């Protein structure tokens, strides 16, 4: 829960999951970039954010 993460400010769990490549779902109202580039998808840019 991104709201709970922002409220408590404790990033240990999300940091450990991101560093260990552990599949997760970050849930919360988020802005997103719309990218129509096929090369960007092949470059795997969505995984770099």
């Amino acid at each position: 829960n991104l709201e709970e993460l922002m409220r408590t400010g404790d990033y240990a769990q999300i940091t450990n999951m991101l560093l260990n490549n552990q599949p997760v779902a970050l849930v919360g109202a988020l802005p997103f970039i719309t990218d129509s580039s096929v090369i960007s998808l092949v470059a795997k840019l969505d995984a770099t954010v």
Binding site: T8, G9, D10, Y11
Partner: protein, 49 residues
């Protein structure tokens, strides 16, 4: 290193060398240096960057 010293001078310098006050410092020591009740308080986010 080689040194020339009077036995009394050697005694003093050897005592200084053998009984230094410096201990190895690592992040565990710093973390335990924080008061234990502040490390457990969820209102404070402590990190080792």
């Amino acid at each position: 290193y080689p040194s020339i010293l009077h036995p009394i001078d050697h005694a003093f310098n050897e005592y200084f060398l053998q009984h230094q006050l410096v201990e190895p410092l690592n992040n565990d020591i710093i973390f335990n240096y924080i008061p234990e009740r502040i490390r457990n308080d969820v209102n404070y986010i402590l990190n080792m960057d």
